[PDB]
């Protein structure tokens, strides 16, 4: 997050960080208290054995324990039609073995229903634990930023990406720069304000640096993959 | 003698602002500055007392807080010529000639830009060699001005991808902060520093293409076999 | 008597109609075109307007 500010302890209970080897790697959001939605590029073959993974939720500053007080990931399900070259279909699910009952500052986010009628220049918020300016370290405190959504036609310009954005992904951010996520902000809650309820419609997959001109942020469109998530949840139970 | 001046000239309209018209008879002044120029037929309505037009923003601005008189008059088309000279210095520095247009045509600017002394529409050819996609032409810029700002960056698999500034054009760019050419509005008694130059058609010595100059238009000035000319008279003291 | 002004054209035209000693009565362009003139107040009288 570049150009943002520290996120105050308000009500944003949809950010769970997945830690392996006692170090922060990536984060994501939750929709139901039985699964965790995250990226798929961090679950590659060298990142197998999901038993050695923990989940931290409702934790702003990442210092409250040491190899304990976490949720063990039971099973990880990745998208079958995943390509490592173009980085398409970057959506993965991780099921926890704990019930994770609802408490203070614990509330999931509902999935976007088909037919949201989203505006072209829609305002959204981004958050995550990444660098500060460029090639930095993991942020100790939780920060957030405000971005705008851009159309896919303008994002596919020859001077921006030269038609390298799949229809399953969208573009968001500012063309002038200074507002972008750096390395480490995998996933991240991308919600919007509509009907007094937030809707998760974004999922960070890749990007070309941060705070750079002509390099917007690329997010995953979970609306097309909603039926896949429903099928996986139906087949799991 | 104002009466003789109005009689010997084919006066079409004569008014004034912050000053009366016939009060000049018998009155004494310190100095009188006269600014005369032709009137385009299409943008004739942009000469009123207060208008957000392109003429008052890039060609000539009329002050409202000063006692100034306006005179729209006509001149026969016999034995008359129009001098189309560009008062820009940095434009002609890189090999700008003339518009080469027909007779009885005047040129008016719609977008005026301003640049600093350290500016060169030219890239260092040593860096452009390691470029494969969107490779702009380069040449040797004279000393005292930095070369074009271009950076080599990889998105997913493109190693030789060079992105420069001022894209696509300085008139409508995606990041005006990264391009040194900035929009400027002319003031009282100040000309336009220069017009927009397309850096993609520039570049031996850095010689930009004559068709790459944008930010101007041409229009005839023939009305009832006569040309209309506006004149502003400002009396100091 | 009504205010005497002169016009140029009519019937949906430019109609550059001109009036007398308008707008400023003090700093006017022609003081001999309208009856309102400046007169110095005498001895024992007030200003009539």
From Swiss-Prot, chain A:
Residues 2-237 form the Peptidase S1 domain. Changing residue 164 to R/A/M: No effect on catalytic activity. Abolishes HKU1-CoV viral entry. Changing residue 86 to A/S: No effect on catalytic activity or HKU1-CoV viral entry. Changing residue 160 to I: No effect on HKU1-CoV viral entry. Residues 85-215 are annotated as: HKU1-CoV S protein-binding. Changing residue 215 to A/K: No effect on catalytic activity. Abolishes HKU1-CoV S protein-binding and viral entry. Changing residue 212 to A: No effect on catalytic activity. Reduces HKU1-CoV viral entry. Changing residue 214 to A/N/L: No effect on catalytic activity. Reduces HKU1-CoV viral entry. This is Transmembrane protease serine 2 catalytic chain.
Swiss-Prot record, chain B:
This is Spike protein S1. Disulfide bonds join 16-69. Attaches the virion to the cell membrane by interacting with host receptor, initiating the infection. Glycans are attached at residues 1, 79, 100. Residues 1-237 form the BetaCoV S1-CTD domain. The chain holds residues 355 to 596 of 1351 of the full protein.
């Amino acid at each position: 997050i570049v150009g943002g500010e520290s996120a105050l302890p308000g009500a944003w209970p949809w950010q769970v960080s997945l830690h392996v080897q006692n170090v922060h790697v990536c984060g994501g959001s939750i929709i139901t208290p039985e699964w965790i939605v995250t990226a798929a590029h961090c679950v590659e073959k060298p990142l197998n054995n999901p038993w050695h993974w923990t989940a931290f939720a409702g934790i702003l500053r990442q210092s409250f324990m040491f190899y304990g007080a976490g949720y063990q990931v039971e099973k990880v399900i990745s998208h079958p039609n995943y390509d490592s070259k173009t980085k398409n279909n970057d959506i993965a699910l991780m099921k926890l073995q704990k019930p994770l009952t609802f408490n203070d500052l614990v509330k999931p986010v509902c999935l976007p229903n088909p037919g949201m009628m989203l505006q072209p220049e829609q305002l959204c918020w981004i958050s995550g634990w990444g660098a500060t300016e460029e090639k930095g370290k993991t942020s100790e405190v939780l920060n957030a930023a405000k971005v705008l959504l851009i159309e896919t036609q303008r994002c596919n310009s020859r001077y921006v990406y030269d038609n390298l954005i799949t229809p399953a992904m969208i573009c968001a951010g500012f063309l002038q720069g200074n507002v972008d996520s750096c390395q480490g902000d995998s996933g991240g809650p991308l919600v919007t304000s509509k009907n007094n309820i937030w809707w998760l419609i974004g999922d960070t997959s890749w990007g070309s640096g941060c705070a750079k001109a002509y390099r917007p942020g690329v997010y995953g469109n979970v609306m097309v993959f909603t039926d896949w998530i429903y099928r996986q949840m139906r087949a799991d139970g | 003698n104002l009466s003789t001046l109005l009689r010997l000239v084919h006066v079409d309209s004569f008014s004034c602002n912050n000053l009366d018209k016939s009060k000049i008879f018998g009155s004494c002044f310190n100095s009188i500055t006269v600014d005369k120029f032709a009137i385009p037929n299409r943008r004739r309505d942009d000469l009123q007392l207060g208008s957000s037009g392109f003429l008052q923003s890039s060609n000539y601005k009329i002050d409202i807080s000063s006692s100034s008189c306006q005179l729209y008059y006509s001149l026969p088309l016999v034995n008359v010529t129009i001098n189309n000279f560009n008062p820009s210095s940095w434009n002609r520095r890189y090999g700008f000639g003339s518009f080469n247009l027909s007779s009885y045509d005047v040129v008016y600017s719609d977008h005026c830009f301003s640049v600093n002394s350290d500016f060169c529409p030219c890239a260092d050819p040593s860096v452009v060699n390691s470029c494969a996609k969107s490779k702009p032409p380069s040449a040797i810029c004279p000393a005292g001005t930095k070369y074009r700002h271009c950076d080599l960056d990889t998105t997913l698999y493109v190693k030789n991808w060079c992105r420069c500034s001022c894209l696509p054009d300085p008139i409508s760019t995606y990041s005006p902060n990264t391009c040194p050419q900035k929009k400027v509005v002319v003031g009282i008694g100040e000309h336009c520093p220069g017009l927009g130059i397309n850096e993609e058609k520039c570049g031996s010595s850095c010689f930009c293409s004559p068709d790459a100059f944008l930010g101007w238009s041409f229009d005839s000035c023939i009305s009832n076999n006569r040309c209309n000319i506006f004149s502003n008279f400002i009396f100091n003291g």
